[PDB]
Design an enzyme around this catalytic site. Structure first.
Site, PDB file in Angstrom:
ATOM      1  N   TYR B  18       0.807  -1.218   0.000  1.00 46.54           N
ATOM      2  CA  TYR B  18       0.000   0.000   0.000  1.00 46.54           C
ATOM      3  C   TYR B  18       0.848   1.279   0.000  1.00 46.54           C
ATOM      4  O   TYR B  18       0.492   2.286   0.618  1.00 46.54           O
ATOM      5  CB  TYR B  18      -0.995  -0.011   1.171  1.00 46.54           C
ATOM      6  CG  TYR B  18      -2.168  -0.962   0.954  1.00 46.54           C
ATOM      7  CD1 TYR B  18      -3.431  -0.463   0.582  1.00 46.54           C
ATOM      8  CD2 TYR B  18      -2.020  -2.350   1.118  1.00 46.54           C
ATOM      9  CE1 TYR B  18      -4.505  -1.317   0.375  1.00 46.54           C
ATOM     10  CE2 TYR B  18      -3.091  -3.207   0.927  1.00 46.54           C
ATOM     11  CZ  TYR B  18      -4.331  -2.687   0.553  1.00 46.54           C
ATOM     12  OH  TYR B  18      -5.414  -3.506   0.362  1.00 46.54           O
ATOM     13  N   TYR B 150     -12.039  -7.764   6.089  1.00 43.71           N
ATOM     14  CA  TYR B 150     -10.914  -7.766   5.173  1.00 43.71           C
ATOM     15  C   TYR B 150     -10.610  -9.203   4.793  1.00 43.71           C
ATOM     16  O   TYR B 150     -10.612 -10.079   5.647  1.00 43.71           O
ATOM     17  CB  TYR B 150      -9.668  -7.106   5.790  1.00 43.71           C
ATOM     18  CG  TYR B 150      -8.457  -7.164   4.856  1.00 43.71           C
ATOM     19  CD1 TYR B 150      -8.384  -6.344   3.713  1.00 43.71           C
ATOM     20  CD2 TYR B 150      -7.405  -8.061   5.093  1.00 43.71           C
ATOM     21  CE1 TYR B 150      -7.285  -6.398   2.864  1.00 43.71           C
ATOM     22  CE2 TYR B 150      -6.311  -8.120   4.246  1.00 43.71           C
ATOM     23  CZ  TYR B 150      -6.252  -7.291   3.137  1.00 43.71           C
ATOM     24  OH  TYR B 150      -5.175  -7.367   2.285  1.00 43.71           O
ATOM     25  N   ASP B 247     -13.157 -16.950   7.364  1.00 43.99           N
ATOM     26  CA  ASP B 247     -11.809 -16.503   7.049  1.00 43.99           C
ATOM     27  C   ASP B 247     -11.006 -16.429   8.338  1.00 43.99           C
ATOM     28  O   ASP B 247     -11.058 -15.414   9.055  1.00 43.99           O
ATOM     29  CB  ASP B 247     -11.863 -15.150   6.341  1.00 43.99           C
ATOM     30  CG  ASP B 247     -10.532 -14.729   5.775  1.00 43.99           C
ATOM     31  OD1 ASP B 247      -9.498 -15.362   6.082  1.00 43.99           O
ATOM     32  OD2 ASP B 247     -10.530 -13.732   5.022  1.00 43.99           O
ATOM     33  N   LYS B 276      -1.063 -16.976   7.080  1.00 50.79           N
ATOM     34  CA  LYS B 276      -0.347 -16.162   8.074  1.00 50.79           C
ATOM     35  C   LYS B 276       0.510 -16.914   9.087  1.00 50.79           C
ATOM     36  O   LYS B 276       1.714 -17.090   8.863  1.00 50.79           O
ATOM     37  CB  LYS B 276      -1.284 -15.187   8.769  1.00 50.79           C
ATOM     38  CG  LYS B 276      -1.558 -13.936   7.942  1.00 50.79           C
ATOM     39  CD  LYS B 276      -2.015 -12.850   8.869  1.00 50.79           C
ATOM     40  CE  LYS B 276      -1.965 -11.490   8.205  1.00 50.79           C
ATOM     41  NZ  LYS B 276      -3.294 -11.078   7.683  1.00 50.79           N
TER      42      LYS B 276
HETATM   43  O1  LIG Z   1       0.354  -1.575   6.688  1.00 54.83           O
HETATM   44  C1  LIG Z   1      -0.253  -2.427   6.025  1.00 54.83           C
HETATM   45  C2  LIG Z   1      -1.550  -2.115   5.626  1.00 54.83           C
HETATM   46  C3  LIG Z   1      -2.301  -3.023   4.873  1.00 54.83           C
HETATM   47  C4  LIG Z   1      -3.606  -2.699   4.470  1.00 54.83           C
HETATM   48  C5  LIG Z   1      -3.896  -1.429   3.952  1.00 54.83           C
HETATM   49  C6  LIG Z   1      -5.209  -1.129   3.572  1.00 54.83           C
HETATM   50  C7  LIG Z   1      -6.219  -2.083   3.693  1.00 54.83           C
HETATM   51  C8  LIG Z   1      -5.928  -3.343   4.209  1.00 54.83           C
HETATM   52  C9  LIG Z   1      -4.627  -3.654   4.607  1.00 54.83           C
HETATM   53  F1  LIG Z   1      -4.327  -5.025   5.167  1.00 54.83           F
HETATM   54  N1  LIG Z   1      -1.744  -4.275   4.515  1.00 54.83           N
HETATM   55  C10 LIG Z   1      -0.435  -4.601   4.917  1.00 54.83           C
HETATM   56  C11 LIG Z   1       0.118  -5.834   4.561  1.00 54.83           C
HETATM   57  C12 LIG Z   1       1.357  -6.137   4.948  1.00 54.83           C
HETATM   58  C13 LIG Z   1       2.078  -5.270   5.682  1.00 54.83           C
HETATM   59  C14 LIG Z   1       1.602  -4.068   6.051  1.00 54.83           C
HETATM   60  C15 LIG Z   1       0.314  -3.682   5.675  1.00 54.83           C
HETATM   61  O2  LIG Z   1       3.289  -5.814   5.954  1.00 54.83           O
HETATM   62  C16 LIG Z   1       3.124  -7.227   5.673  1.00 54.83           C
HETATM   63  O3  LIG Z   1       2.066  -7.281   4.715  1.00 54.83           O
HETATM   64  C1  LIG Z   2      -3.864 -11.001   5.845  1.00 56.85           C
HETATM   65  C2  LIG Z   2      -5.220 -11.557   5.546  1.00 56.85           C
HETATM   66  C3  LIG Z   2      -5.627 -12.064   4.198  1.00 56.85           C
HETATM   67  C4  LIG Z   2      -4.721 -12.043   3.002  1.00 56.85           C
HETATM   68  O1  LIG Z   2      -3.453 -12.652   3.223  1.00 56.85           O
HETATM   69  P1  LIG Z   2      -2.306 -12.549   2.067  1.00 56.85           P
HETATM   70  O2  LIG Z   2      -1.408 -13.693   2.488  1.00 56.85           O
HETATM   71  O3  LIG Z   2      -1.807 -11.154   2.320  1.00 56.85           O
HETATM   72  O4  LIG Z   2      -3.045 -12.717   0.757  1.00 56.85           O
HETATM   73  C5  LIG Z   2      -6.935 -12.538   4.025  1.00 56.85           C
HETATM   74  N1  LIG Z   2      -7.835 -12.574   5.020  1.00 56.85           N
HETATM   75  C6  LIG Z   2      -7.571 -12.147   6.283  1.00 56.85           C
HETATM   76  C7  LIG Z   2      -8.647 -12.223   7.317  1.00 56.85           C
HETATM   77  C8  LIG Z   2      -6.234 -11.587   6.617  1.00 56.85           C
HETATM   78  O5  LIG Z   2      -5.924 -11.115   7.847  1.00 56.85           O
END
Ligand SMILES: O=c1cc(-c2ccccc2F)[nH]c2cc3c(cc12)OCO3
Ligand SMILES: *Cc1c(COP(=O)(O)O)cnc(C)c1O
Ligand SMILES: O=c1cc(-c2ccccc2F)[nH]c2cc3c(cc12)OCO3
Ligand SMILES: *Cc1c(COP(=O)(O)O)cnc(C)c1O
Lengths: 428, 428
Positions: B18, B150, B247, B276
């Site tokens: 982002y 999300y 999720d 994760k």
């Molecule tokens: O700061 C982060 C913010 C977001 C983010 C931004 C807008 C909407 C949803 C998100 F998960 N997504 C992130 C995803 C990441 C990360 C940091 C961020 O480091 C490892 O992968």
């Molecule tokens: C972080 C996250 C995802 C996406 O994971 P990526 O490995 O970044 O694609 C999807 N759903 C939930 C609820 C998450 O927290």
């Protein structure tokens, strides 16, 4: 767990690529080891060494368990496995980004790491879409491609997959409706490019980008086309202000006789995807690269940022092993190596032309294809190639290979002969 | 490369989550090492030890460089790095599938491996769509969620993200049009479930599935809700024949005080996503599990298969470390550990309720949240947390933490103390 117990857990609990649960025609073979160009597989309960003719779905370019890549991985492991890429950076990401920027076609200056080819494709499309929103033209949102292509399994990627290859009939009403040109032919026909341009011209006000696999279309049917079509797309995209995206997830890192298949034509896309062979087959990792112009437009636009960020973005372990994989490739005479492999594949597959079930034999770098006039039955061909010490996986009507670059003339011979024999049994 | 060289390369060539290129207000910190709960970061030329309060975006449940996870990875490295999962199976995949089936909510019997959360979400949606196609109800193709959610950054994933959080316009005529219930309240209100049912009732014939993060909504705003809504969601889905998808990509593996957040309510979804913490934050890996009934209907359907197959599906290295990560969690008294962490976050964060800029302080398992009255300026927050030996990364108006499980009471107290101090600075 024993191989018998592995089979039983697998059949009850494991999905496989495009597979079923409980209705599998055959039944997967247990793998227990992989080293260099060989897998150790369990047949009739016994371990047997077989050649990885497939490079484990186009990934194992340097072979499995290559000492330089094991060490790259172990070195990184002892220092830093992973840190989040949000707020932080690190040496493996930097090192790899510099290589990629330097070795990819001219002008691809920024790198967005992700975890898979499909995701890198969606990132590419998102780049294209945000680019035009940045330029004040939100109507430019559709994608254009030619038929025969494959781009991955995620929903946006599926939308630009060949409608038969990707089974669009099962998906009526759910996918984005994209713009499809006719199948790109093998030999160069300027009339095809002219027709492609006319079709594009009437959609230009609504297209973000043209997306294609350059030179070689892989999972959509292993078709090759004249590099000069790519030169014409570059020219069409330039004159009608449509972005050009090359998907080099299958073609990248030497596979087709050039560093990137783009190089055959001497042309730069605005956005590029790489994956599959990027980590030399060790770990999942992909990248999307784009020009400075795309990067700045996105960054100066309403949103101020590319709206994407995978959890494991720029993973240090994957990046460390990729740096080693790429440097290993660049530190040798890879162009000769591929030329020799191609000659080996041409020579060995020549006798297959005569076979009654064979419509085509064609070779491009370390890619050898026998095209048949009917679906190849795996229940026949799989044990048939194993018998000869070769792991081969025909798909649809194709008996084909993407052998590791470290394969010796004798190994290629062994591969081609297994392939020729699979083609013979199809005709009978 | 040196720290300075890394910055120079990074600023020119690397996209971050982002982020922009060239318009980065703060600039990323260089990470050079990670051990247990600590990162070695480069601050003003000098290396410092800081607590990884974020667990590297919710991944490092066991800390970095855990000797059991390190070993599991090197052990698998010398045996088999990776083979294609098409036609082949292996021990790491069967061991992990067995584990996942055994410890997840009851009835979740099949496992589809993939490389990332967003992909596992697109796979879940594909199972739901194909299931209903298997039943002759191809009209059941939309998804329904509640607000504040999300689910990843790929285009289908995006369509069910919060329409404000995910900036759905921006994405005007590109995203699938999904069904959104109002934001789920923290406290249990039966009027909410009744309104949910009534809204679902009028789309039942066009809904493939309900998809929600159970108990804890992560990237949408660290919101907690009463587990009893999940029980209502199960009941409503059952009665209206709409599949239920959880999720659990952020919530899984003990993070909310239960093994899986669904457990807080005793509910089994039809389809579940994990990622994760799956690999203990070593490598990218996700999984999508579904019931036997779901698997059989897709398998008995016209397609005969789940039309999906990532290149690195079920990667041995990644599975082997996950196996060791899950085993290490299950082999200790993880429940008591998570209760202890929660009690320490609660005690340590209490003083922040008084602060002028704080609107809420909430804790659930190893998740601690200070909700502020304004967006948090990272250029102030980040150095402040660094000064106190803590890596904190605020998001919108939240100063929050999800520490590794191996954090001692004193380390937790150092974390919370740094969080309080950041919250204090926001108030001026
Ligand atoms: O700061 C982060 C913010 C977001 C983010 C931004 C807008 C909407 C949803 C998100 F998960 N997504 C992130 C995803 C990441 C990360 C940091 C961020 O480091 C490892 O992968
Ligand atoms: C972080 C996250 C995802 C996406 O994971 P990526 O490995 O970044 O694609 C999807 N759903 C939930 C609820 C998450 O927290
Ligand atoms: O056999 C495979 C077939 C497909 C596939 C199926 C239909 C359309 C396009 C495809 F790439 N995709 C695959 C992807 C794989 C794989 C095998 C396959 O092993 C590792 O990753
Ligand atoms: C395999 C492939 C993809 C998708 O890669 P995954 O890692 O399987 O998602 C995309 N594009 C091309 C050209 C491919 O060959």
């Amino acid at each position: 767990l024993t191989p018998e117990q592995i089979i039983a857990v697998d059949g009850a609990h494991l999905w496989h690529p495009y597979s079923s649960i409980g209705r599998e025609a055959v039944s997967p073979v247990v793998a227990v080891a992989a080293h260099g160009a060989w897998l150790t597989l369990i047949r009739d309960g016994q371990p047997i060494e077989v050649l990885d003719a497939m490079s484990s779905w186009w990934t194992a370019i340097h072979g499995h368990g290559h000492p330089a890549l094991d060490q790259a991985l172990t070195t990184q492991l002892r220092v830093m496995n992973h840190v989040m890429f949000g707020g932080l950076t690190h040496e493996p990401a930097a090192r790899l980004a510099k290589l990629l920027v330097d070795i990819t076609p001219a002008g691809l200056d920024t790198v967005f790491f992700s975890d898979s080819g499909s995701v890198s494709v969606e990132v590419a499309a998102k780049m294209a879409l945000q680019y035009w929103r940045g330029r004040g033209l939100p109507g430019k949102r559709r994608l254009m491609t030619w038929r025969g292509g494959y781009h991955g399994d995620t929903f946006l990627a599926m939308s630009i997959c060949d409608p038969h290859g990707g089974m669009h009939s099962l998906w009526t009403d759910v996918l984005a409706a994209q713009v499809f040109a006719p199948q790109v032919p093998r030999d160069y026909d300027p009339a095809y490019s002219a027709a492609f341009e006319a079709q594009l011209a009437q959609h230009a006000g609504e297209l973000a980008a043209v997306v294609v696999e350059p030179v070689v279309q892989g999972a959509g049917g292993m078709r090759f086309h004249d590099p000069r079509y790519l030169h014409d797309l570059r020219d069409i995209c330039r004159r009608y202000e449509v972005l050009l995206i090359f998907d080099e997830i299958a073609t990248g890192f030497g596979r087709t006789g050039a560093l990137f298949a783009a190089d055959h034509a001497g042309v730069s896309p605005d956005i590029m995807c790489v994956g599959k062979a990027l980590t030399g087959g060790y770990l999942s990792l992909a990248a999307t690269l784009c020009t400075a112009d795309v990067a700045h437009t996105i960054s100066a636009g309403a949103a101020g940022a590319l709206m994407h960020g995978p959890t494991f973005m720029a993973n240090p372990l994957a990046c460390a092993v990729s740096v080693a994989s790429v440097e290993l490739l660049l530190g040798q005479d890879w162009r000769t190596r591929i030329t020799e492999l191609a000659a080996g594949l041409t020579a060995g597959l020549d006798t297959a032309r005569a076979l009654p079930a064979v419509t085509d034999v064609r070779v491009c770098g370390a890619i050898g294809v026998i095209e048949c006039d009917r679906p190849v039955d795996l229940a026949v061909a799989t044990p048939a190639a194993l018998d000869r010490g070769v792991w081969l996986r025909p798909f649809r009507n194709l008996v084909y290979a993407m052998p590791p670059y470290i394969c010796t003339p004798a190994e290629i011979t062994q591969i081609t002969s297994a392939m020729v024999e699979v083609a013979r049994l199809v005709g009978s």
